[PDB]
Automatic annotation (TrEMBL), chain C:
<protein>
    <submittedName>
        <fullName>Portal protein</fullName>
    </submittedName>
</protein>
C-alpha cells in the first residue's frame, strides 16, 4: 500500500561535522633515522 | 686517556657448532630499577625532551641557556637542517 | 574553520586536476623555453 513516509534527518550534520574536523588535520608518514645510524639516513627515502 | 668508555663485550663460540653462547655476569645484572615516565620512540627524542625541559627551567641571558640551545641544535635529524647542526657543533668544540 | 571547508577541499582537488590538464596541453602545444647557463668566466 502507499502511505506517507517522511525523512526528517538529524544525524547527517553530526557526520558532516566529524568528517570536516578530521579533514582539517592531515596526517602523513614521517621517516626518522634510527638512533645508532647517521643523522641523514631517512633523506632519500623521505623524498621518494 | 681519561674516561674512556670501552663498552667491553664478551662472547664465545662453541667451536663445535655454529651457534653462539651468551656470557652475562651475575654481579652486574640487576643494577637499574624500573620507573614510569612519558612514552617516546627513540633515545634521541628523550634527550631532546630533557634539553627542552632544562631550557624551560633555565633563565635567559645565562651561559647555561646558550649551552642548552647549542646542545638542542646539535641534535636535529633532517638533512635540510645541517647548517645549524654543524655550526652548533663547531661552537661547542671551540668553547672547550 | 569555515562551514564549507569540505567543499573548498573538493574545489582544490578539481583545481589540481585542471592544472595537470593545462600543463599537459602547454607541453604539447606551446614553446617552453629551456634554461641553460653558459657558466662563462666573464
Amino acid at each position: 500500500t502507499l502511505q506517507y513516509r517522511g525523512q526528517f534527518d538529524v544525524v547527517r550534520p553530526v557526520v558532516r561535522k566529524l568528517v570536516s574536523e578530521m579533514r582539517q588535520n592531515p596526517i602523513d608518514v614521517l621517516y626518522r633515522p634510527k638512533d645508532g645510524a647517521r643523522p641523514d639516513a631517512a633523506d632519500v627515502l623521505m623524498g621518494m | 686517556g681519561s674516561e674512556k668508555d670501552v663498552q667491553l663485550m664478551a662472547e664465545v663460540v662453541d667451536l663445535a657448532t655454529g651457534e653462539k653462547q651468551v656470557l652475562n655476569d651475575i654481579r652486574g645484572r640487576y643494577e637499574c630499577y624500573t620507573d614510569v615516565g612519558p612514552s617516546f620512540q627513540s633515545m634521541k627524542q628523550q634527550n631532546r625532551a630533557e634539553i627542552l625541559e632544562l631550557l624551560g627551567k633555565t633563565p635567559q641571558g645565562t651561559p647555561e641557556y646558550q649551552l642548552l640551545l647549542l646542545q638542542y641544535f646539535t641534535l636535529l635529524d633532517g638533512k635540510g637542517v645541517e647548517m645549524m647542526r654543524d655550526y652548533a657543533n663547531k661552537q661547542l668544540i671551540q668553547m672547550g | 574553520d569555515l562551514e564549507t571547508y569540505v567543499f573548498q577541499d573538493n574545489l582544490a582537488t578539481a583545481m589540481r586536476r585542471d592544472g595537470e590538464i593545462y600543463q599537459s596541453i602547454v607541453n604539447d602545444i606551446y614553446d617552453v623555453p629551456r634554461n641553460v647557463t653558459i657558466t662563462l668566466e666573464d
